[PDB]
Structure 1
Amino acid sequence: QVASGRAYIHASYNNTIVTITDPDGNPITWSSGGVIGYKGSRKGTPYAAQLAALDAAKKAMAYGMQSVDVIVRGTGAGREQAIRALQASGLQVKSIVDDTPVPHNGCRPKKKFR
């Protein structure tokens, strides 16, 4: 049972995924737009991110989680809304960092992205 921990926000154009970890970074609980009754592109919406981040923090609070650092990956419609929703969670949000991965000109992208 951990009070301090982490929130990882995976925000794509298709969906928003929140996974809350221990301080070591091991998942405690997670949630997504799909974990709420959303399928299709409705998963992508900011409302969905919100509903997901809530349910994630909520579930985390049952393991006695209070403080989290928030780590953000991707450019989503739900990116900001998730950040908001964790702050309104009752969780402490001890920090916010953008870890979104970017190539130093790496692998060739799928034709869509060129």
Structure 2
Amino acid sequence: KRQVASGRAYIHASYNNTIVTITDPDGNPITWSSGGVIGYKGSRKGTPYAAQLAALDAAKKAMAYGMQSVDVIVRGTGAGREQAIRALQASGLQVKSIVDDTPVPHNGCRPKKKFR
């Protein structure tokens, strides 16, 4: 009910999960998916296969919205951070460009004990 025909795709990948949000050229989201949206529940959500399935599910929902041309934004690092982009390439969506916009601070906040 939108007929967007073009937009962005943000891939947020971590070591516990990978999620894909397909949005429009001025930032508002259209659809999304993740390792928990699909069957997997626990650490299974962090596998590259779950990332591939999440990317494919989000891409098919975008097809339902009528998406053809997609720009890719990538934030984070984890298993399947690349598999998501590979499935997104071979999903049937013409990939416009891939961009890694992983937010990194300028040494602002103190991390948790795990991260020091």
Q: TM-score range by the shorter chain?
A: over 0.9
Aligned length: 114
RMSD of aligned residue pairs (Cα, Å): 0.5
* Residue segments in structure 2 that go unaligned for 5+ positions in a row: none
Q: Choose from 5, 18, 21 the match for 1:16.
A: 18
Equivalent position to 1:54, from 50, 53, 56: 56
1:18 is displaced (CA, Å) by: 0.1
SS in 1 for 2:114: helix
TM-score (norm: length of structure 1): 0.98
User: What displacement does 1:29 show?
Assistant: 0.2
Identity of aligned residues (%): 100
Shift of 1:33: 0.4
Deviations 1:75-95 (A, max 9, x none): 110100000001111001100
How far off its partner does 1:42 sit?
Answer: 0.3
Summarize deviations over 1:60-83 as a string: whole Å, max 9, x none.
011110001000000110100000
Please give the per-residue CA displacement for 1:10-49, whole angstroms capped at 9, x wherever unaligned: 0000000000001111110000000110011000000000
Name segments (4+ residues, structure 1) moved above 4 Å: none
Q: Give the structure-2-normalised TM-score.
A: 0.97
Partner SS, residue 4 of structure 2: coil
Q: Aligned partners of 1:86 and 1:67: how far apart in 2?
A: 11
Structure 1, unpaired ranges of 5+: none
> What is the distance in 2 between the residues matched to 1:63 and 1:52?
16
